[PDB]
Amino acid sequence: DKIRYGIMSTAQIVPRFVAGLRESAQAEVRGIASRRLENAQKMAKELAIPVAYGSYEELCKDETIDIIYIPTYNQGHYSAAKLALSQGKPVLLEKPFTLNAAEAEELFAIAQEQGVFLMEAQKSVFLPITQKVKATIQEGGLGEILWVQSVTAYPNVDHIPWFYSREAGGGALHGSGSYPLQYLQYVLGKEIQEVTGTATYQQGATDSQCNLALKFAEGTLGNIFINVGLKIPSEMTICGTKGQIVIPNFWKTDCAYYTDAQGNTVKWSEQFTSEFTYEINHVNQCLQDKKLTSPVMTKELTIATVKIVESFYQEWFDN
Amino acid sequence: LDKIRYGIMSTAQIVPRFVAGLRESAQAEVRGIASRRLENAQKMAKELAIPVAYGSYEELCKDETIDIIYIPTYNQGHYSAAKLALSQGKPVLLEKPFTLNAAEAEELFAIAQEQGVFLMEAQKSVFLPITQKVKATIQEGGLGEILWVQSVTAYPNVDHIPWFYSREAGGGALHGSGSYPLQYLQYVLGKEIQEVTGTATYQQGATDSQCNLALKFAEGTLGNIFINVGLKIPSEMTICGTKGQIVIPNFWKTDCAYYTDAQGNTVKWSEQFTSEFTYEINHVNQCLQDKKLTSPVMTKELTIATVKIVESFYQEWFDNE
Numbered sequence: 001d002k003i004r005y006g007i008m009s010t011a012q013i014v015p016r017f018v019a020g021l022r023e024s025a026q027a028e029v030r031g032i033a034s035r036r037l038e039n040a041q042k043m044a045k046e047l048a049i050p051v052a053y054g055s056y057e058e059l060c061k062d063e064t065i066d067i068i069y070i071p072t073y074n075q076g077h078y079s080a081a082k083l084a085l086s087q088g089k090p091v092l093l094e095k096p097f098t099l100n101a102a103e104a105e106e107l108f109a110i111a112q113e114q115g116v117f118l119m120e121a122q123k124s125v126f127l128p129i130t131q132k133v134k135a136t137i138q139e140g141g142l143g144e145i146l147w148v149q150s151v152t153a154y155p156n157v158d159h160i161p162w163f164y165s166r167e168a169g170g171g172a173l174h175g176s177g178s179y180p181l182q183y184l185q186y187v188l189g190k191e192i193q194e195v196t197g198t199a200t201y202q203q204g205a206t207d208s209q210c211n212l213a214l215k216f217a218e219g220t221l222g223n224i225f226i227n228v229g230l231k232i233p234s235e236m237t238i239c240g241t242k243g244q245i246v247i248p249n250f251w252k253t254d255c256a257y258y259t260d261a262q263g264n265t266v267k268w269s270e271q272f273t274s275e276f277t278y279e280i281n282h283v284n285q286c287l288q289d290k291k292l293t294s295p296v297m298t299k300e301l302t303i304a305t306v307k308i309v310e311s312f313y314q315e316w317f318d319n
Numbered sequence: 320l321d322k323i324r325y326g327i328m329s330t331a332q333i334v335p336r337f338v339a340g341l342r343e344s345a346q347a348e349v350r351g352i353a354s355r356r357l358e359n360a361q362k363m364a365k366e367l368a369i370p371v372a373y374g375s376y377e378e379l380c381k382d383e384t385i386d387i388i389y390i391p392t393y394n395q396g397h398y399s400a401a402k403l404a405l406s407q408g409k410p411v412l413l414e415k416p417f418t419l420n421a422a423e424a425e426e427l428f429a430i431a432q433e434q435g436v437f438l439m440e441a442q443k444s445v446f447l448p449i450t451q452k453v454k455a456t457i458q459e460g461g462l463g464e465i466l467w468v469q470s471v472t473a474y475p476n477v478d479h480i481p482w483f484y485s486r487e488a489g490g491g492a493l494h495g496s497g498s499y500p501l502q503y504l505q506y507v508l509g510k511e512i513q514e515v516t517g518t519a520t521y522q523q524g525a526t527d528s529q530c531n532l533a534l535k536f537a538e539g540t541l542g543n544i545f546i547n548v549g550l551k552i553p554s555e556m557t558i559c560g561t562k563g564q565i566v567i568p569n570f571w572k573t574d575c576a577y578y579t580d581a582q583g584n585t586v587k588w589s590e591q592f593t594s595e596f597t598y599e600i601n602h603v604n605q606c607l608q609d610k611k612l613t614s615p616v617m618t619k620e621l622t623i624a625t626v627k628i629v630e631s632f633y634q635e636w637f638d639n640e
Contacts, residue, residue: 209467221531
């Protein structure tokens, strides 16, 4: 029974997520906070949330809330999430998890000393189609994988008013490098062993695009390409000695294409429920099993990622 | 009426196809081939209607009838073989990998220049008519601003080449086909490569079986090159601009290309040919005729640079002395 969720903001993403909890298995949204109550209420009523707080401290002190979701702006994750973990309540922090590796680890540590769950929020790794790609790769399927690549391109970035600030959000890499690189490690069951790349960026700004070279734990190379400006499709391709899979919009896909060693390519089609519904369920389940961390979106994978992402922006905006 | 008389320094497997294209050109004609053993030369010399046969390379260089020598000898012998002919006062057309050492490639141009002789790396990709269309389309704004280009190349089996895993011999995936995509890509773009990094799959004391390159070009355009063995996927190259793109199948020997314009409709460009060698050859002839020592396309700069780039990777990987 149960599982009431508290929301730490009025982030435009809040509703879709709330819709998600509703489509979820055993979870309901209880409590929503702000710094400005009227702001919270307005959405608290727009949606069907029943409690309200003009402060995050409040949302925390409350006990009618079991776990909190922090979909706030980037440089405020750390403080926001630190105000919960220290206070006892479990956290579902968003991407970027952190814009600083150290900040990332601490977060996990104090979360542990408090014996309270802590996971980064990634819709992709829990989709029904993603689960099958991983299934197939392990069970023979494509022979061994030698190379994987990802292409992500947004036409405009004018709906992200802070796109060109390093300290705030970031660039193409901050924007969407974690998902693809986390995802691959997951479907392959291998850890990123190497990574170096290039990128486009004027000074005192962010990178409009970047192209990452990759190496995995098992003889499989990879390429990640995030871009702004192009109008090409976003698709991931897994290539094995015996097969291939192409995944369109891997973070919200319901379908994928598998090609065999013979020429035959088929379409896998697992249908659109809710896009958020899947990770929420996983999380709920993690909680039932009194677990501090997720076995998929593990601690090391989350830390490891911010580390890489930050060494890159370090590499660029500094020196 | 007169023609440039070509000399072939070896009895390479590629020789017959080269001779096929040579014969298809306007001003070329074959007149000599030489091997380190004589019948090894005459055997091929007789199947191909090639007059003259020499039993050594030295003889081929001494012959006053050969106006130029094509060297398709094994990788380790490019340097020594070219040095021989250029120092002997003959112009050379050398097969790639042009060399396995930057300084060696540099010296080769040093002697050619001191001998006032023509020298170029044999490279068919850059001369195809289809490639020209791509270059022009990009320069006239056909695709807008180029933000990303990529190239994938796969060879199911590499078991028709024994030395493939000898870093000393010919090399790995990057020695085998990395020079074409980087030179092809720089050439179509009008931009120079100014940054490159990558990862590769290799065992110790071995060459790479796979290879993934990340790179940067002047003017804000990024790229990725992927070369490998074992996969069965097609070999494609893609140029992505803000107003459209182009997909090139088997760029090194293709007669077609897939252009997609700003509006959104894609068309198939098409040209036909019997040999990938012809374009490369009569371009070479046109160079000899105009009396030049270097080619404006496959330049000294480009080649030397490409060699530096390829070897730098074998240095990181299988080395670090």
